[PDB]
Design an enzyme around this catalytic site. Structure first.
Site, PDB file in Angstrom:
ATOM      1  N   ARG A  11       0.824  -1.212   0.000  1.00  0.00           N
ATOM      2  CA  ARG A  11       0.000   0.000   0.000  1.00  0.00           C
ATOM      3  C   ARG A  11       0.865   1.273   0.000  1.00  0.00           C
ATOM      4  NH1 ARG A  11      -1.572   2.873   4.223  1.00  0.00           N
ATOM      5  NH2 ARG A  11      -1.443   1.139   5.740  1.00  0.00           N
ATOM      6  N   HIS A  13       4.204   1.556  -0.860  1.00  0.00           N
ATOM      7  CA  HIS A  13       5.372   1.637  -1.735  1.00  0.00           C
ATOM      8  C   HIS A  13       5.305   0.965  -3.108  1.00  0.00           C
ATOM      9  CE1 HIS A  13       7.546   3.557   1.490  1.00  0.00           C
ATOM     10  NE2 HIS A  13       7.262   2.549   2.302  1.00  0.00           N
ATOM     11  N   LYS A  42       3.776  13.234   5.323  1.00  0.00           N
ATOM     12  CA  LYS A  42       4.985  12.438   5.283  1.00  0.00           C
ATOM     13  C   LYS A  42       5.976  13.182   4.385  1.00  0.00           C
ATOM     14  CE  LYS A  42       6.373   7.645   4.659  1.00  0.00           C
ATOM     15  NZ  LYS A  42       5.903   6.254   4.451  1.00  0.00           N
ATOM     16  N   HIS A 120       9.400  -3.084   4.714  1.00  0.00           N
ATOM     17  CA  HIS A 120       9.960  -1.773   5.021  1.00  0.00           C
ATOM     18  C   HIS A 120      10.723  -1.272   3.810  1.00  0.00           C
ATOM     19  CE1 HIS A 120      12.456   1.287   6.992  1.00  0.00           C
ATOM     20  NE2 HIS A 120      13.524   0.635   6.561  1.00  0.00           N
TER      21      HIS A 120
HETATM   22  O1  LIG Z   1      14.039   6.829   0.037  1.00  0.00           O
HETATM   23  C1  LIG Z   1      13.198   6.704   0.933  1.00  0.00           C
HETATM   24  C2  LIG Z   1      13.549   6.832   2.373  1.00  0.00           C
HETATM   25  C3  LIG Z   1      12.555   6.694   3.330  1.00  0.00           C
HETATM   26  N1  LIG Z   1      11.178   6.413   2.937  1.00  0.00           N
HETATM   27  C4  LIG Z   1      10.191   6.288   3.968  1.00  0.00           C
HETATM   28  O2  LIG Z   1      10.327   7.416   4.777  1.00  0.00           O
HETATM   29  C5  LIG Z   1       9.972   6.974   6.074  1.00  0.00           C
HETATM   30  C6  LIG Z   1      11.036   7.408   7.067  1.00  0.00           C
HETATM   31  O3  LIG Z   1      12.257   6.941   6.664  1.00  0.00           O
HETATM   32  C7  LIG Z   1       9.734   5.491   6.070  1.00  0.00           C
HETATM   33  O4  LIG Z   1       8.368   5.255   6.171  1.00  0.00           O
HETATM   34  P1  LIG Z   1       7.816   4.223   7.207  1.00  0.00           P
HETATM   35  O5  LIG Z   1       8.142   4.576   8.639  1.00  0.00           O
HETATM   36  O6  LIG Z   1       6.332   4.043   7.173  1.00  0.00           O
HETATM   37  O7  LIG Z   1       8.366   2.850   7.033  1.00  0.00           O
HETATM   38  C8  LIG Z   1      10.349   5.065   4.805  1.00  0.00           C
HETATM   39  O8  LIG Z   1       9.729   3.981   4.254  1.00  0.00           O
HETATM   40  C9  LIG Z   1      10.839   6.306   1.549  1.00  0.00           C
HETATM   41  O9  LIG Z   1       9.691   6.064   1.199  1.00  0.00           O
HETATM   42  N2  LIG Z   1      11.869   6.459   0.566  1.00  0.00           N
END
Ligand SMILES: O=c1ccn([C@@H]2O[C@H](CO)[C@@H](OP(=O)(O)O)[C@H]2O)c(=O)[nH]1
Length: 125
Positions: A11, A13, A42, A120
């Protein structure tokens, strides 16, 4: 209903339905529709434009350190089509605003479970 960690990764990514960001408004639309801006904006989020099978396969590729020091991260051998969504200077919750940028990079993910799949998104490199 129940949402697993692997499903949440999809969802947050995965977008296999397009080869790349489909418009300049792609990030604004996706950050909203995937429910990523509920309580705060975010600052950055990456979507991957590859098949689910090809992204899941990364969990059997190059073991690397996650940025937090964990060692359950994996880097893709292939270079993947990705979109980086990043807040603009004028973005202000609840009106979150994003610039859509296209890239082609390796991805780094954290993996868990059986099947062993991403939970992740760590980085693109
Ligand atoms: O290149 C990147 C680096 C980080 N994140 C996202 O940025 C947030 C903090 O690092 C993370 O989301 P999460 O806590 O829900 O897992 C990570 O997935 C990205 O999407 N792309």
């Amino acid at each position: 209903m129940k949402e697993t960690a692997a499903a949440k990764f999809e969802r947050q990514h995965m977008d296999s339905s397009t080869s790349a960001a489909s418009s300049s408004n792609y990030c604004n639309q996706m950050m909203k529709s995937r429910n990523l801006t509920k309580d705060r904006c975010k600052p950055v989020n990456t979507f991957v434009h590859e098949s689910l099978a090809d992204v899941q396969a990364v969990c059997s590729q190059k073991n690397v350190a996650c940025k937090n020091g964990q060692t359950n991260c994996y880097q893709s051998y292939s270079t993947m089509s990705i979109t980086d969504c990043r807040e603009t200077g004028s973005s202000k919750y609840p009106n979150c605003a994003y610039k859509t940028t296209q890239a082609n990079k390796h991805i780094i993910v954290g993996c868990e479970g059986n099947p062993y799949v991403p939970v992740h998104f760590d980085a693109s490199v």
